[PDB]
Amino acid sequence: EVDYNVVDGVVNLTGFVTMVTGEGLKYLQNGRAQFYALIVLLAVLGFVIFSV
Amino acid sequence: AVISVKPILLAMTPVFILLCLFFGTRNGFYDTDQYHGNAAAH
Amino acid sequence: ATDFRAIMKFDGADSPAMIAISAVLILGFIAGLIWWALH
Amino acid sequence: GTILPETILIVTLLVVLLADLIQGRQADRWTPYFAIVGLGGAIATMIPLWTQPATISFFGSFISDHLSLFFRGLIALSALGTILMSIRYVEQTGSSLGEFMTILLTATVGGMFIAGAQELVFIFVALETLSIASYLLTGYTKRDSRSNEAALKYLLIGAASSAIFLYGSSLLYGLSGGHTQLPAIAQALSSESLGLVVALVFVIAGISFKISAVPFHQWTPDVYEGAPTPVVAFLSVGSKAAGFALAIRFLTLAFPSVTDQWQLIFTVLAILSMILGNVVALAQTSMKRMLAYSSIGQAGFVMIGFVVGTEAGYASMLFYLLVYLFMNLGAFTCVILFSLRTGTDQISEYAGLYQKDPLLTLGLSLCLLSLGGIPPLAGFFGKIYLFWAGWQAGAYGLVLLGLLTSVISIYYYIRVVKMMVVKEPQEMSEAVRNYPELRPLQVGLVMTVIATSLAGILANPLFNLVNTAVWDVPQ
Amino acid sequence: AVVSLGVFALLTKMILQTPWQLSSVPPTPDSITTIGQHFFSDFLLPFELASVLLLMALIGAVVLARRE
Amino acid sequence: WLTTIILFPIVAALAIPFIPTGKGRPIRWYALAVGLIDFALIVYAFTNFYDPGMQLWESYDWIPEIGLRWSVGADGLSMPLILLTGFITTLAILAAWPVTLKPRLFYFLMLAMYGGQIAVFAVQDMLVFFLAWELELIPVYLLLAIWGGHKRQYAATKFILYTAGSSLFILVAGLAMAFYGDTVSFDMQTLAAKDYALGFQLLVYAGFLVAYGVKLPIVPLHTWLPDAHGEATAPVHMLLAGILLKMGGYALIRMNVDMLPAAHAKFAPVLVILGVVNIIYAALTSYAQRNLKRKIAYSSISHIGFVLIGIASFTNLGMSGAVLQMVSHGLIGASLFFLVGATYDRTHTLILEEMGGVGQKMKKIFAMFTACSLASLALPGMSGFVAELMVFIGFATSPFRVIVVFLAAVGVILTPIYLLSMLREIFYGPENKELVEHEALVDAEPREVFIIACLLVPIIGIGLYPKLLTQIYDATTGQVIARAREVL
């Protein structure tokens, strides 16, 4: 049972994590052009702050 | 002294090939006597 | 789990607590031995 | 002066007019053929001026070194494949054909111009030809609401990004006195500054919209679902190749070869692109949406490709992009050939296809597998050469990260093969029960699959090609 | 607002920091003959190519707003 | 020769799609003829194989722009395993006669992973090594996911994921050793003759280890194995368990004892304690497991600990014990899993308590299975014991090596526990009632008996006079261990 739970579950949890990450990151994509208008030019202007 | 595998292999492998092709024909259970399956394990 | 139903019928072995205090012993065993081995 | 570097472009331009005139007189003609003929004649005209003469400039507004030859031929092949696909796909819908190929060739001419340009005005005009043609083709089938919505959103976003690019180009004209060139621009200002960095970042914003990098990506998924499929097949390959040619020929040559912070910015964008596309395509059900996020991740692989400039990272980008052309066009040919017959639907409806149409299964399987980096297949060699180059320079996190995201992307690339192969006749979907079983599409699919399945081991003839191409870029 | 405002300040911080090259020479009045010369000396490709741009835009809008 | 050996099965496999049929019969004869001809090429190129180094290497140049060269090379350390794959994959094909479900794809993928298994040994370029290591993924994925098992979804997915994400540091490591200095080597020999600093020897080593310890599954890097070797038919399994684990062991030897010896000397105790952990862990998990196949998979996991110990020793004997164990288990586990597949085919059941006394009517598989089971454990007169004995002797002759021997010899007691309990549960006792009404399979058609007899002749010929298998690599292993002791 240590093999099937404490060893197996730990690595299957890797698939679970990189699955739920995809399930929860798509909400960044929301179907709004104005949200792109935000995270296009505000997506940058951080890249100027740690630049000069 | 010491014995070498080279002539042993050269003498065995033709017999292996011939018997392999022969016993390929000899068959049974898998053909019709039973075994509706298809060699998949489901 | 539910698949292991044979003469292997120990009840208090599938609980998460017992699994935890078993994995503790096994991991500590291999760890004591890897420390014994390096040093 | 010196219209010889221009011949190809105007040659294609000629047929644009022709494919409208025959389409204005007859209204039902054989225009799908001889567009292939002129594109082949263009790619044939490329060889006499590849290396036999030396590099030359038109008037300083246009240079035709080997790099421009590469990108022009690449975009031409993309247009050719997209035509061969779209002939009987757009005819299946109640829409014309002449204006379609007119606009497609126009985008092609724009992207074949922008790969050899070194002047701000001409960069902008060619960029806008390609952009506006894409805005149209995204919405060419206005019977559906989603097509028109995608065309609207893509048009508005691209107009804003282009205006940002145009502001930055204005600044870069401002700074160094006059100079609207590019070799003279990064010639009178040669030091770090605030305004040079602002111009840099705005041009990055303008380019990332083209090459689909994140966070500049939000158009790709929605547009690739909504838009016509063969339009997307040209869009990804050609717009990316134009974008990367623009990136090199601007950032390296006209812009500056001094303020090399853009390398850091492309590392950031590539990291995010790998982590986003290959992870979020893993949670999808449609093919076109999946291919969109795939394309994002593949762009990330390329972006670590050319962030390490040592005369091999650039070459690796070029080869991997040549290879992604074949791979992605093959995948789109297969999804076209599936969506035509009966299906017209998403991933889950591919199940049980190996019994009905094995040819399509071979095609799409090999293409999807090559995209994930499977042995002998061209995408594998492209990815390992990217890793070789980007590791040679000293980027260690990027290589491990891209390897890992390829290992993640194999999952959703193999879901499709689980459907098409593993699923047994007890698990077919309703679409495949009644599957029946055009010519130019089949020959294109074969010409594509044999390439992506054989152009990985036959690689020296087209590594010599690329390393001959990339002597020219500064570094 | 804040995003937009930041950009303005950022741009302003450039506009007042960089040493522009004022180039004290009287400009030229004939700003139409010169553009004619530039359409056929320097910037000829954009002329010839904006031609087909306008063609393609007409072909597009004519077949995207058509009522059918 | 090696290039013909590798490309003829693959090239001849591309003919199968346009090859006549009425139901699916003439494919398997073609595949078997290809396998037999290629094995003949092995043993005929083994005549001109003198017995220290690469006794034949045929280099070429594909990509000079990187350093990629088609550098095939045989060796004392790699020729036994080439013979082994050429023999055992042929016998897998000679075991897969009843495959009716998609036989074209079967005998295409089987021939593809017949060059994908000889290549990993007959390759000396570190990029082509990665290529051949990688090209086992899709064929094995389809071999598991289409035919074989109910949990084959999770099994195949977990397989390809782990053997991709841990087929990951092999390339990174080959690179990391390729550009330490001013030469773009990409070659085993030229890259083993380089002076690597300890600061990254033991980092590139762990990079190799995360790869060579999942395919040669060590402590937790095994959980793919029960699922991928449980949900798998027999002839698939013969390859998956008889060659690929040996691929891991071979590459471990050749990339971590000729090429990072200074870190090997510092990490070897880890391999040793890991090996005895592997033995005891796998044996307990096998005696606990009840199904039928997962049991024998954990038995393989148990038997790999002798390899870990023999490589993590430093004398000239433990290495030979490791290689002998490898050639032994490749011959033993193959017959075991073949008989398990046959027993499932006759019973349509795996679970132990759900059947008993089947050896009253099905009394031909019982003898063959008893013999292979006696061969699993360290029985004398066979190669399974010579390996164990040589490992014990060579290691002790070198962690204060008196406790680890005491723990590794527990397997001597602990293997027959689950093996003989399995025999008792399956074949001994009174026949089941009508609960087993599957008509006990007509006892092993001669065609199965030939498979296991030809797997059971070499094992005894080894166990009686083991030098037959040790004449191959007394020179190469001698040079390797002389190097690895010259460092220390």
Ligand SMILES: CC1=C(/C=C/C(C)=C/C=C\C(C)=C\C=C\C=C(C)\C=C\C=C(C)\C=C\C2=C(C)CCCC2(C)C)C(C)(C)CCC1
């Ligand atoms: C091929 C090969 C090989 C081999 C070689 C050698 C090593 C040989 C030897 C050989 C010898 C030196 C011989 C011996 C003989 C013996 C015999 C002949 C015996 C046994 C057999 C039999 C008799 C069996 C039978 C049976 C069965 C089948 C079942 C169970 C029961 C019994 C056991 C009865 C190797 C490994 C390298 C590798 C691979 C390939």
